[PDB]
Amino acid sequence: QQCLITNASNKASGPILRPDRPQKPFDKFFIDYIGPLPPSQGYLYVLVVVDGMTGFTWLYPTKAPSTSATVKSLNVLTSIAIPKVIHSDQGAAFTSSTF
DNA sequence: GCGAAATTCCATGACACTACCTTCCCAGGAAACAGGTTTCACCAGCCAGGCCTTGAATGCAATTGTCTTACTAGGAATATTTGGACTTCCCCACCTACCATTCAGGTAACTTGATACAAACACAGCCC
Numbered sequence A: 001q002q003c004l005i006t007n008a009s010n011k012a013s014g015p016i017l018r019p020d021r022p023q024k025p026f027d028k029f030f031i032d033y034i035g036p037l038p039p040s041q042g043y044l045y046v047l048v049v050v051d052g053m054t055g056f057t058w059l060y061p062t063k064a065p066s067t068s069a070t071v072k073s074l075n076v077l078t079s080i081a082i083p084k085v086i087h088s089d090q091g092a093a094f095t096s097s098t099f
Numbered sequence B: 001g002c003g004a005a006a007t008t009c010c011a012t013g014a015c016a017c018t019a020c021c022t023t024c025c026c027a028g029g030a031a032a033c034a035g036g037t038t039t040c041a042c043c044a045g046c047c048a049g050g051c052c053t054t055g056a057a058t059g060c061a062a063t064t065g066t067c068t069t070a071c072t073a074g075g076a077a078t079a080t081t082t083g084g085a086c087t088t089c090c091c092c093a094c095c096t097a098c099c100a101t102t103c104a105g106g107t108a109a110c111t112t113g114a115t116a117c118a119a120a121c122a123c124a125g126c127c128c
Helices: A067-075
Strands: A028-034 A045-051 A057-062 A085-087
Touching: A045 A067, A057 A067
Parallel strands: A028 A085
Antiparallel strands: A028 A045, A045 A057
């Protein structure tokens, strides 16, 4: 067990999966902060909410990727309509028990 | 010819300079703190009477402010003379960076120990 946890596999994973598109908009949002960018107006982080139906991006810049900076960023966007599913990454701000 | 065994094959992944940074979690405990209740005693607020200190008015005395003159020394310019700070070049010892080893201290605990505070009665010093 000194040689099992250092050598890496020479066996690639198989074919990638293409999951199907949803059949309506407002079904899957794919959200991920970008940044730290170069600063402007006291902003560094930009929430990016892509619709999984189309590609229709939504931008909601914030000061710092906290939980509450995301929550008010979607209250603008939940004013439009309500999604069923929101995908993300396992972010520092999304995995919080508050969010 | 099947199976067992000895061998060659080939598709692939990771190495490329790396740590911080942010936000949320966890956590245990604790930090007190912010919050709040409770009660007793005390310090602050209240008001007036008497006296002393301050303010003012003053007269005057010397203190101080101005004027004037003879002058001493300061400053500047000089030459020079002299006294040194820093730039320079080089080497060694000393500080550091390191690991291993160990000792000492801080926390911590249980005990002990000792002193200060709170209370009471009296004494002495100073003042009215």
